[PDB]
Structure formats: structure tokens, C-alpha cells
Amino acid sequence: SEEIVLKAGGKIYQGWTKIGITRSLEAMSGAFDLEMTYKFLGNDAQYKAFIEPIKQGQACTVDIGGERVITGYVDDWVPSYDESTITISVSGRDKTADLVDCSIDYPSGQFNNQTLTQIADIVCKPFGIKVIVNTDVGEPFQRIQIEQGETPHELLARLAKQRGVLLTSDTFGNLVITRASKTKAGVSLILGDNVKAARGRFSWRQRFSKFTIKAAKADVTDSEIGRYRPLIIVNEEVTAEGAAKRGQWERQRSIGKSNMAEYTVTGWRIPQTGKLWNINTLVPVIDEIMGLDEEMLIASILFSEDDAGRLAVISVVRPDAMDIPAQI
Amino acid sequence: EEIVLKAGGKIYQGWTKIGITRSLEAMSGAFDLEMTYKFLGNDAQYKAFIEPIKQGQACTVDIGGERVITGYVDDWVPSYDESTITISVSGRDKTADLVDCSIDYPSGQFNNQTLTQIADIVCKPFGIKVIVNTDVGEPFQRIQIEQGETPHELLARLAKQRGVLLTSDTFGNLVITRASKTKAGVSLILGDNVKAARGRFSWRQRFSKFTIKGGIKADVTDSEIGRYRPLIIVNEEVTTAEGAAKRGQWERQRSIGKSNMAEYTVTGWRIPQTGKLWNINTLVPVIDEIMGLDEEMLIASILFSEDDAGRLAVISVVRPDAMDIP
Amino acid sequence: EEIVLKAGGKIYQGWTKIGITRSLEAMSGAFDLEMTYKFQYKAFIEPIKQGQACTVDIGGERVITGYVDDWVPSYDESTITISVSGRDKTADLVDCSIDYPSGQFNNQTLTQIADIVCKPFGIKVIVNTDVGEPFQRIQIEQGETPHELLARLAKQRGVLLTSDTFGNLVITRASKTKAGVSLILGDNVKAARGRFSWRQRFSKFTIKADSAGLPTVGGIKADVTDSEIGRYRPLIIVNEEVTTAEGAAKRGQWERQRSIGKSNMAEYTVTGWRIPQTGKLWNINTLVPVIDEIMGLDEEMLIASILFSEDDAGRLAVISVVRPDAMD
């Protein structure tokens, strides 16, 4: 019922024929793609241009029922046509994409005795991006030097990793500093109830029984893997406690990379709560077919619409799969 | 007019599928030619209709008697099943050898030679001729051949230094040229002669400012890009503020061509007005309100295709300043 | 002849989509087994857990011995799809690092070293050919896998590594053993496909180990010519390993034979997994006469790999054939 609207350039664009919006905890800035395909059966499409182009670069919002889904910029304007077809589409990312694409211009080239939050405030400001803090960022860093051509995202992400926190964004394209949430979606995904379809992949191709980390050592065991499968790794950033932490990070990364579960539901809104499905919320999962019975963390959502209807694809992970400690 | 492949004293025409690509940006023209027969009877199945065309043979492709490819068959691609037999050949201009093969030049160095002189030397043993179409500029004081370097790789970096383009002609010669101002003799007009078109206009790789790097730094601004989007690049090759400005302009220019694409599909391979095949490196006026184009564009690439339905030219156009590298 | 997966104390029958690869080119091959059940949102079997030891047989004959890599469940409103995939046991040699605290092998043959590195994986080494002289000193490269190490040794001894149906490591040579069947166009070939190219073929292979007024001259070098490429097409390759002129020529010839293999493809589709004339499964590393006027083949070819597949229509074997001379 609620309509989905793209606003760009003081203009309003509704009636799209295909919409895909990603929100994600693992890919800074997510994505939107909107397409409108008209067919002209009089074979006179080329005499029947309808909208003025959406300029690439334009500030952009997508709303459902007046509620914000994504805030960013048009990356790509993508027109095409033939004798009986006009297709226009735009693609882009939320505001934080500037943090991913662009260089840090902080002329003194180093931060002194600053927390992650103070640094993020600095590098984000000339992009007009707000920094939201939802967790303890811990101690200041004594001295941080900008690497050559380092982007605001690459800097913040490396700092984040030394403080055991995560970087993401909100629906308003603000930078969010957080940790894996305790907040509940207010809903379960129950096989036979609200799950329209689902898909999984559970692998040991990248799983190992023992991670040995060497400076250039320390063993980190993964007791889930009951066959002899050793992995030795040099990591020149490494301390015996440091190598153990990097080994633990290594076990944790291989686990997340080896499990996938994606649930397709009807609607972008949770019917119980009436709230949009949201990343970094916890959702009980009861799925006998797949072999899941645990509370999971929503890591990503694909919100889509076509002729068939509105769907949301919810990618879920073990809630401590995105929880780390700190770097060297 | 037939498309004729000539190879090994033999002549082949009557292809059921054709794709011939020529490009200002490519080191060699390319072809793909296929003969298929379907719904074969019980006695017709599993029977060769042609002696295999051997890979590696010198060949030419002509369209209506006019050369479009002078090179070699790269690939012999036969296939069949219970009701079908398909044979296909693909290949490239002679200048393919400059892309595939190593420079063998015992001394490993050129001294006080121009791009042209160096090109002449490295192409020579492949029996490839160099055609010079533009100002090649100053000689290079000293050039070393890097380990395993190909003629294409060497000549490419030299052309980058001099602001010129490397391509081939229809005769398999190496052509050193620049973007021309030669007119195509026709316009691409929405509602007139365009069958289909597609485009992509992106700011993904566009920046508001290019800062290059010594003590020397220079800011080259891109006025097309109206959001704060800085890029900082260090180049240890630059030693001057004029050098840093020059590399910044080179970086800005490169980001344009990389960010825009437009492709026009028209009926037939020849321009009706002139009777000639569409040609690369010519200027074509484009009036197209759906894309958002109302200007002269440069033809960078053409695919001449044919199948069941008929013949199409797919013409890739770029803003002419995208081809002018300084 | 039913095809079965034996894993986890059970024999699984009723697979509807099967793909099994045996290859001289890809250590460990692959299996993929899938079942689609048209029925709502209810598990009918228990998850087939990734990691389990497993066997695939056809008509009681062993085809692959290894582990389940992936458990790939899915479902929608009307169907449940269950999918497993894996490798052969030798996959552990491909995935994993060598854990050998000495770091070096002294005065050992290829066989002795293979005996050592396969042992903790529980993989028997089968030797079916003269492995030749011992190596004097072999150092294990940083994070070297057992297959990596043995593969670089095996090429210096003019031999090949593969696997048997029991997941043992096999050290062998291009075989003289005939398959007992010819592949003949109009006879037993359902479909075939080929690509014969000179894109990666060269006339001469040269392998090698402020301007100087007096450059240092000489150096370790060898030329190896490919008489079949009748045009000037030279390739110069700097191998930093090679310290001898004899070694560079052996590298050169290897490079020439590899180019031939890389440049030709021929794949024959036949009905069935067994050879009607012998009753045996098609086997890699056996010779097959090929007669084929469409492609232009009239030679004895070696089987380099087989894809055994099954679906709705029935069982096919895709036999990938190669010139023997460029394997020996």
C-alpha cells in the first residue's frame, strides 16, 4: 500500500518497475538501484521521452510511506531505449560512500591522543557526514599517522579494529560506530510461519582445526573442525598475546566466511511491529530444514520490489561472528 | 555483399553469425565467424560439411571486397550434437603478435630514438609495418626493455609519455595516431536512424579535486564535479610543480572517459548517405534527448554484427576530449 | 546401478542431479549431489553435516572417497532442495599447510617426502612409476601446502600427481594402458565440443635466470623451439629458481608442452558412465583412439578428465581428451 519514492533534484519519482536496496553491516554504504521500463506498442518509443534525466552525482533519498530507507547520492545514470522500449535506471550508495572513495585531507597528517570518535568527527566533517556513537570506543590513540592516500573509511576501519567496534551507517547516511547489538528485531523467523523461502551454505572449505600465527608464534584451536586441518599464517603486524588475538580473529573470520543463511520474507516491514527490517538486530531462527535453532544477528538486508511484490531478504549470522577484541 | 574469409588458398563466405570489432583503443581488429546447421536429418547428422580450417593461418576478412582484417586465425572451434553441427573461427590483425609475444632485442636498450624508430625496430621481425599519423614528438634519451616486456607494453608506455594513440589499420599495420576531427558524414539522431541505444554516466570514479604529491604539490580541480570529493596521489616520477600540475590534468582527463559510455545501434554496416562502412576516429553529431546528448561525439569502437535477423552496427561513442591524452 | 552417498552412518539414495569430476589437472576432483523434493516447510531428512567422511559409489563400485565440503539446503513455498558437495581426501593436501618443524627435507626422494607430508592427513601414497633420484635439500616455502610442494618436486622428476578412487595420492606417468574403446563420430559420440588455438602457442621458448658501459655478459639461458608454430612468435620467461643450463631447457620443454595442453580442448559426450565394450567406468589417464572428421581428429588421445553427470534425461560422461605427447 505504502508507496516507495525516490526524491532527487526537488523532484519525486514513483512508479519504478524494479527496486533493489541493500543495507549491510559488512559493506560500507550499501546500495540502491531503481529502474523504470516502459514499452510502447506503437513502436514509437523514440518520440515519447517522458522524464528529464536524473543527473549522476545528485543527492538522493528513498522513502517507503514517508519513512527513510536510504540517503545518499546517484552514482550512475543509466538510460537505454529501442523502438518500443525506454528504460531509465539510477544506481548509487548512501552518503558514507564519499568516505570510501575519497582521500583524507587533514594537512597536519596525524592525530594526537584522540579517540576513534574524535578522529571520525574530524575526517567526516568536510563531507557533511554526522558520526553517531552507540558503544564504548575505549581509550584514545596516542599517535595515528594517515597513510599515503588513505581514505576516511580505511582509517576509521583500522582504528575500529583496535577497539573491537564496528562501523556502519544509518538510514540517514550518518556514520555509525557500534558493536553487535542486543536489540531484538521483535520477531522470529519461523519455518512454516513467516518464511516465504530460504537458502543456506555451510562449508568447511575455509575452516581449519588449528590456526598458527607467526611473527616475521601462537596456536588458536577451532574445536568445531574434527579432522587435522592446519593453517600457518605470517602476519607482520604482530607479542604472544597479540598473535593469539590475531589467531582468534582468524578463526572468527573463517567461521563467518563459511556460513551463509538468507531468509526471504514478504514486505519490507515486520507485520508485528510495523517497523522496517533493520540490520544489527537479533532475530530467533527456527529452521529444521537448514538445521538452525539459535538467535541470530541480521547482518544484511536486500529490500526489493518488482511486479511480483515487495520482498526482503534477511542475511543472518551467529551474533558473536561479528564480535572481536582489538589489534596489535 | 558477402563477408569473405580467405585463408590457406581457400575462401569462405555464407556465415550464419558474424562479429567484427574495430576500435581506436585496441591493438588489433577482431573477428568471430560461425557456420551452423540445425534440425539435421538422420543421415545428415555427424557429417562434416567442411574440411577443418587450421588455426594459425594467415588470413584476410573482406566486407564487399573491402578489407576489415589482415591477420591470422587464432581459434578453430568445432561443435555438434544429435541435430546440429557448428563450426566457428576467430582471429585478429597481425598486430596481435605485438600483444602476445616478447621483445627479443639483445642489447635491451634504445638510445636517442623516437617512438617511431623504436616502433620500427620492435615490429620488424613480426613483419609488421608502422604507419605514423601524428606528431611523435621528441626522441627518448634512453629506454630500457623491461623483463619479458612485449612490443605492445613498451610502445604503450612511450605513447603515454608523448600523448599519442596506438591502434592498427585494416591491413594489420601498427598505427600511431591522435583523435581526429574528420567527420563521419552522418549524424546519430533519436527518432531518425537509431535502432537502439544505451548509456552509463557515472561519478563513481570522478573527483572534485586531484592533488598530485619533493615539497611539490599541485591541485587540479574538476569543475564538472560539484560535491566535495578529494583525491590525493603521490607520484615519485614528478619532480616539479609544473610536472605535478601536468600529471593532475592527465588524471582528471582519464577519469572522464572512464566514467561515461554511450553505444548506438543502427541498421546495416554502411552509412546510407556515403555508402562507406562506419569508421572509427570520426566525429558524428548526436542528438538524443533520452541519453542527454546534443554534441559531436567521437567513434571509439564499432562492432559489425550479423545473424538470422540481419546486419547491425554497434557504435561506441565518447566525448571527443576523452580521447585527447596529454 | 544406483548412485549412493555413504556418510554419517547412512547410505543416501535418490539423488536427482549428480556431477562427479575426476581430473589429471585438478587434484581431488569434485562431487555434487542434489535432490529436489516437491512438497510444506518440513524437514524430511536431518541435515547432512559438512565435514563428514564420505564415499560415493555407483553400482557398488567406488568413485570418490573424501569429505563433504558444503551442506547447501534451500526451500520455497512448494519445494525443498538439499545439496551436498565435496572433494576427495587429497583436498586436505590442497587446503592445508605443511606442519613440519624441521622445515627441510634432506637426501629424500619424492616418495619419502610424500610419505612424510601425507601422513598426518591419513593419506596413503601410491607410487606407480619410477620417481628417480633423491633431492639433496628441499626447503618448505612460507606456508607451503603438501600438494604445492610435491607438485613442484614431481615436475623436476618428470612425473604427475593424481588420486585414485580411494582418495590415495597417486604418483604416476602418462599411461600406455588402453581404455578398450574408441571415440568415433557417428558411432558412440552423442555430442562433442572443441577449441584449438594459437593464442598461447609460441615458436620459441627462452628460459632465463644509469647504463653500464661494459654490461655483464653470459648467464643461464636455454631456447626450446615449437616446430608447429610456423611464424615468429617468441616468448622469453625469467625463472628465478633455475641455476643450470640443463635445468632451463627442462623448464623450457615443460613450458612448451604446457602451452600445447592449454591451447587445445576436446570434449566428447557419451551416454552412460560405463564403457559398454569393457563394462568399466571411464578412467582418467587411459588412451582412447579418436576419429572425428568434424574437428579434424584422427589420433590416440589421453583422457585428462571426466565429468560424470546425471539429471532427468539420464547419465552422461563428458570425456576431456588431450594429446599424450604434451603430457610426456
Automatic annotation (TrEMBL), chain B:
<feature type="domain" description="Baseplate hub protein gp44/GpP-like C-terminal">
    <location>
        <begin position="242"/>
        <end position="324"/>
    </location>
</feature>
<dbReference type="Pfam" id="PF22255">
    <property type="entry name" value="Gp44-like_2nd"/>
</dbReference>
<protein>
    <submittedName>
        <fullName>Mu phage baseplate assembly protein GpP</fullName>
    </submittedName>
</protein>
<dbReference type="InterPro" id="IPR023399">
    <property type="entry name" value="Baseplate-like_2-layer_sand"/>
</dbReference>
<dbReference type="InterPro" id="IPR053981">
    <property type="entry name" value="Gp44/GpP-like_2nd"/>
</dbReference>
<dbReference type="Pfam" id="PF21683">
    <property type="entry name" value="GpP-like_1st"/>
</dbReference>
<dbReference type="InterPro" id="IPR053982">
    <property type="entry name" value="Gp44/GpP-like_C"/>
</dbReference>
<dbReference type="InterPro" id="IPR049354">
    <property type="entry name" value="GpP-like_N"/>
</dbReference>
<feature type="domain" description="Baseplate hub protein gp44-like N-terminal">
    <location>
        <begin position="2"/>
        <end position="93"/>
    </location>
</feature>
<dbReference type="Pfam" id="PF21929">
    <property type="entry name" value="GpP_4th"/>
</dbReference>
<dbReference type="InterPro" id="IPR026276">
    <property type="entry name" value="Baseplate_GpP"/>
</dbReference>
<feature type="domain" description="Baseplate hub protein gp44/GpP-like second">
    <location>
        <begin position="95"/>
        <end position="178"/>
    </location>
</feature>
Automatic annotation (TrEMBL), chain C:
<protein>
    <submittedName>
        <fullName>Mu phage baseplate assembly protein GpP</fullName>
    </submittedName>
</protein>
<feature type="domain" description="Baseplate hub protein gp44/GpP-like C-terminal">
    <location>
        <begin position="246"/>
        <end position="328"/>
    </location>
</feature>
<dbReference type="InterPro" id="IPR026276">
    <property type="entry name" value="Baseplate_GpP"/>
</dbReference>
<dbReference type="Pfam" id="PF21683">
    <property type="entry name" value="GpP-like_1st"/>
</dbReference>
<feature type="domain" description="Baseplate hub protein gp44/GpP-like second">
    <location>
        <begin position="90"/>
        <end position="173"/>
    </location>
</feature>
<dbReference type="InterPro" id="IPR049354">
    <property type="entry name" value="GpP-like_N"/>
</dbReference>
<dbReference type="InterPro" id="IPR023399">
    <property type="entry name" value="Baseplate-like_2-layer_sand"/>
</dbReference>
<dbReference type="InterPro" id="IPR053982">
    <property type="entry name" value="Gp44/GpP-like_C"/>
</dbReference>
<dbReference type="InterPro" id="IPR053981">
    <property type="entry name" value="Gp44/GpP-like_2nd"/>
</dbReference>
<feature type="domain" description="Baseplate hub protein gp44-like N-terminal">
    <location>
        <begin position="2"/>
        <end position="88"/>
    </location>
</feature>
<dbReference type="Pfam" id="PF22255">
    <property type="entry name" value="Gp44-like_2nd"/>
</dbReference>
<dbReference type="Pfam" id="PF21929">
    <property type="entry name" value="GpP_4th"/>
</dbReference>
